[PDB]
């Protein structure tokens, strides 16, 4: 997370770490006793389900946390729309091998209904253990990082992306997406934050508005990060609850 700050331990109980062969590759967000939302690209077909693990209640990634359950994965369902796009449908459900027990440090976030809209400029928080700058690692013991970022309409976000757009590197924000960040940059999610929650408070209550997805760089001017809309998939996700 570029330009953020360290969360207190237990401040984002729905945040999870995703490891392939014991290496953190993606963040994730817990949504029930046994399910996790993340991003489709964090799970290329070449990888083996058996080698995916998940860490929860994990505040400092490189530290033995007392209450920090770890689980293998029973299932991985990327959205049907994905394997034929690389343009849309960038989300996956992870079924844990066994349902886990909630504690002060492990707790799911609520999903927004399909017909849910969040006002622009609403300040939301993204959270991850990603690079703190273009290819610069978060420093051990890797405290979960957080960052308030305002939501940006997809029309305005496409205006931004067109600024100094490289014809060969097209970035378009699709209907299943939303942007959050600052136009002058410096604040944004980076590599390793994919799958992470964009949590938006609505009346003392946290909703999973987006899943960290992609962005031009991270801290780039006129290139705020793009997140996969949770609401655009509520229908689908509800099809396994």
């Amino acid at each position: 997370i570029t330009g953020g700050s360290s969360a207190v331990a237990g401040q984002w109980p729905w945040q999870v770490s995703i490891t392939y062969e014991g290496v953190h590759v993606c963040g994730g967000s817990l949504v029930s006793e046994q399910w996790v939302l993340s991003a489709a690209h964090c799970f290329p077909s070449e990888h083996h389900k058996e080698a995916y693990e998940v860490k929860l209640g994990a505040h400092q990634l490189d530290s033995y946390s007392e209450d920090a359950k770890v689980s293998t994965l029973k299932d991985i369902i990327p959205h049907p729309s994905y394997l034929q796009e690389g343009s849309q449908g960038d989300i996956a459900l992870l079924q844990l091998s066994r349902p886990i027990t909630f504690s002060r440090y492990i707790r799911p976030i609520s999903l927004p209904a399909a017909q849910a809209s969040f006002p622009n400029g609403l300040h939301c928080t993204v959270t991850g253990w990603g690079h703190v700058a273009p290819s610069v690692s978060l420093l051990t013991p890797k405290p979960l990082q957080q960052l308030e970022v305002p939501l940006i309409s997809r029309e305005t976000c496409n205006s931004l992306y067109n600024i100094d757009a490289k014809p060969e590197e097209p970035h378009f924000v699709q209907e299943d997406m939303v942007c959050a960040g600052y136009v002058e940059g410096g604040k944004d999610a980076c590599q390793g934050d994919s799958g992470g929650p964009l949590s938006c408070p609505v009346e003392g209550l946290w909703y999973l508005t987006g899943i960290v997805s992609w962005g031009d760089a991270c801290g780039a001017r006129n290139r705020p990060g793009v997140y996969t809309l949770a609401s655009s998939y509520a229908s689908w996700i509800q099809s396994k609850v």
Binding site: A39, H131, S135, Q191, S194, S213
Partner: protein, 54 residues
């Protein structure tokens, strides 16, 4: 060889997937962080997949 001359391309997505690229100036197969999409061709799953190609 060929595209073995391009710099490593991380791409727009924000996963942390470790990949190898050929550093032609260095004469070396180097690790970089790939994001999970829009990979160029100078991007290998393994060190030897790399040296082999270039």
């Amino acid at each position: 060889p060929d595209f073995c001359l391009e710099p490593p391309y991380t791409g727009p997505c924000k996963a942390r997937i470790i990949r190898y690229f050929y550093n032609a100036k260095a004469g070396l197969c180097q690790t970089f962080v790939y994001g999970g999409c829009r990979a160029k061709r100078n991007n290998f799953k393994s060190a030897e997949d790399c040296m082999r190609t270039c």
